RNA sequence: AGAUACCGUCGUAGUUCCGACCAUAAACGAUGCCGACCGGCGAUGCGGCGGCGUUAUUCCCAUGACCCGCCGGGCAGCUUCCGGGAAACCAAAGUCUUUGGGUUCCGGGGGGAGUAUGGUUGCAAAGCUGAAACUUAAAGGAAUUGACGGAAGGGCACCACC
């Protein structure tokens, strides 16, 4: 039976979209199909930002971030708990969880 | 493309009856539609219409009552003999009390009742009950 | 460990519905009230019921309760039925009017009233939250 | 209804929607005969007579019942022709 | 209600609609509420036509006067703003109030203690009081509904276009209606301006109760 | 049917004729491969010479020897 | 057996004040009291159990065998009710379905095949009724035909008082509940069908709630 | 058997049938 | 255990380009095309039309960038007792026993079988066309309830842990 109206992707009037390699695997997944995360992240978490500002050459040097876009296959995204099985109603909720 | 102007009109008034609209617009007018509509009106399944006259295939605004159960076409136009008309009205009309097969005879477009009196069959147009 | 069961709470909310007037904050009276106004086969259950009666009596004297109805709420149904304030906020002489709220009144017989105040309309036709 | 004798033989004649002319079924439970009270022309008070409209449930769940009382009222000059 | 100067929109009546702001509709518009609007403002607020507001409240009042036994016109409001206005209207008109928490099956289920079986509903908001509209379907109940431009007209049989969001505009549209149903019965006279005050029907914010206490100390 | 036109008798008939072969009860009867394989050759009954007596095992649910004859 | 009526509509029936259930059917009033039909059509009303259909829900340790009883009811002149009740014991299902049938009873319209002499015998038009895949179609038939139908929808049309009827069923009619309902939805849509006889504009007579508003205040709380 | 591998068995067996029928012509 | 597998290190044809062949995919929206009609809403892409005001070329005019609509086609989305459907779901899968707008292709229980055979296309691989004997009482669809999971969560317990 049909589980998702979009067939679990986001091509509508295309026919073909270029496959990307998964970051965890290297499974060739269509760009629209892939679970995508744009994680903006500090080069140090919380345990080192205290230690580096103290031992800086520069006063008022904001510690720069690390910009990585993560592409996932569905088997990597669910196994690493990025996405998650939802109830048949809750599936349709396209609002990203805050 | 549009290959039965009568069929695309009878359905248009039928969808409006199913919905409960008080009057319906039917974009292409033919003498065949007007003659079909006038036959429904003399039996009183529609209120008075008016053909809007452009320098083209005119339009019609039919004032709908809520008397019309279904208005349906027969395509193609099966030629009907009087000995075969009873078999048509067996399996096209609900009861032998009400409902009318109109069919285009030589004596003009008219219901099967008027087409019986004149003892003259012809090509079936559609029906309404 | 001490949660009242429905048997205690139903007996409580019906005793305070009916015999409200006899009851009050004091436990030891409305312990002994239950001996006259019910047939309870247990001493332990009598105290449970009478205990949650006093807990509801401190609630009822403070405000309305979800699962109760008495004649003092019927009296305060009548009290707040007669809150007559100082003259209302509708009997004003300056009621602010948009040019377009004037246009629809101009079409009516109420063209210009002496006690209206027409303003200039808000420039920047800008009334939607952006998407995301 | 009639036979050859002419006598009405069926056991009840159903009502018929005042908006769309469609007869109201024996179990159309969303049907509503509503009395619009008649006001005295010069007093502005209730006469004792009513302007009765029956609307079938297929209109109410379509969202067209309060447009069609508004038309049935203005057809009977309850609502102003100006409106 | 039409061509009758006795049921004319009185000169006092407009300035109450303008003060309370019952003309002042929603941001977006329902397709069946398009007939109750003059114009859309620059700064997208839909101006409700107060003439066509008045013509419906008169039609709604006729619906309630036409009910002989006044008890069984069950009056309903779930939101903050109407709970007071309905309990006033029920005593004022002689109707039955349901102010806050309409239990599902109070019209359908026989064995419920609150098996009310009315002849007419009056509703503060379709989108808020959506529940009694779906039992107004199951038992042969005509609906009256105080409606707004962004509100849907599903199952509602006579609808008054209002600002049923606004604080005072709810109570005012109840006050206007409580009066008119009495005027037509012949309790109130159309000569004398009515004793009962429109402020009586307004929802009192418990924040303003603790502030009015120290202002009137 | 699909093609309704007043002058469409040869397609409706030839379609019905072509698609009748996809019926099992038809193609079995109207190709003589069934009749060529039928040991009776279309006969209701037939006579034959008994040449041994076979004890046929029944199907799994019903375990018993069905005493048949090779004719 | 006293029966103190719960509903407003029920009270009028017990006081012999609303005197025909055609006055109930006219105003589309839901009949929630069972002992209204036991009053009007009471002893004229025949019970035949169509079927006992044992249903099962798989639980942790075995199946819970509930019994679905289908009762068709009706006096052999104007009224039928198809009631179904799923109980745990078989006797309760029958008693439950008899009650649920009576609540569900409809008036069947009956007309004439062609010539219009005597008392009516057949369906007034070509009604259809379908639930599930089962499409049931009833057709008017001449006097003395009997019901040309399957034994079960025949069993309802006999109860309805339709003496003559051609039928043409379609779909999985071996599943009875669908076939019993589908035929019931056909003889529910007889009075719902707008024939030119029913073109005379409605003269809206007074509702029994409005007629007896003087009595529905004082005979109870 | 996967319908694809069922199909691949036929295309190896059809391939050997053609082989034998070339040897006899 | 085996591991001619998954994992790892290498690596042939291939992957790239030019020119010919092949004609198949879950080539899927598993949904033929043309036309008519039947609810709502907010978006979006494109063109056009009109309408306060901000901004740029500032020095205006006309133009871009926003903003508020309207219209036409377009990919879509949500919404509902239009209606349909076995249901899942579908404004199309609706307008269907109240059965006919036009037309094309194609199905007839499951296997045997896309097999054998013949024809045909191709260098080959194979493509197109395509049986029968025989076998079999089911195969299958949707949904429900349980049970199970080397799925995800939320509990409880000194017959669990700390």
Numbering used by the authors:
A (entry chain b): 2 to 99
B (entry chain X): 2 to 130
C (entry chain S): 2 to 133
D (entry chain W): 1 to 83
E (entry chain B): 2 to 218
F (entry chain Y): 2 to 72
G (entry chain D): 58 to 278
H (entry chain An): 1 to 25
Provide the authors' own sentences about this structure as they appear in the paper.
This family of viruses employs non‐coding RNA sequences, called internal ribosomal entry sites (IRESs), to precisely exploit the host machinery for viral protein production. IRES sequences from this group dispense with all canonical initiation factors and are able to assemble by themselves an elongation competent ribosome, successfully redirecting the cellular machinery for viral protein production by an RNA‐only mechanism.
The binary IAPV‐IRES/80S complex populates three major conformations, with limited differences between them. The IAPV‐IRES maintains a similar global conformation as in the binary complex with 40S, but in the 80S map, both the L1.1 region and the tip of the SL‐III show good density as their dynamics are restricted by specific contacts with elements of the 60S: The L1 stalk stabilizes the L1.1 region and the A site finger and the ribosomal protein uL16 the SL‐III. The additional anchoring points to the ribosome contributed by SL‐III, allows the IAPV‐IRES, in the context of an 80S interaction, to be stabilized in a conformation that overlaps with the space occupied by a hybrid A/P‐tRNA.
